[PDB]
RNA sequence: GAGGCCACGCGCGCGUCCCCCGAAGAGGGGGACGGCGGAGCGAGCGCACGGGGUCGGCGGCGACGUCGGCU
């Protein structure tokens, strides 16, 4: 009973940083995309 | 408005901030930043204070007198 009265009681529901930036950019994971990004910057060139 | 530094450099759209007119301080027009968004790839020569020396540098001397042998 003390189980079951816990378990129901449980329950019942209701800038830029620039350092910062590149740590999040060296990341393995998380910068994944942040420097795949930067890599097509340095290889397509387009107008406008 | 007659210099110095930057390990700052593609677009499109999204966001954040700043600017304009603002004809509801609506709605669009511009700058800066972004760590945001589903879609593949740079190669080709070199120089080196770069994961322990190499020269694609050279000279002299050599048989009955001398050459080497730290034992």
Do not use: F, Q, T
Request: glycine fraction near 4%.
């Amino acid at each position: 009973k003390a189980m079951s009265a816990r378990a129901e009681a449980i329950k019942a529901l209701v800038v830029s940083r620039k350092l910062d930036r590149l740590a999040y950019i060296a990341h393995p994971k998380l910068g994944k995309r942040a420097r795949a990004r930067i890599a097509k910057g340095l290889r397509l060139c387009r107008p406008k």
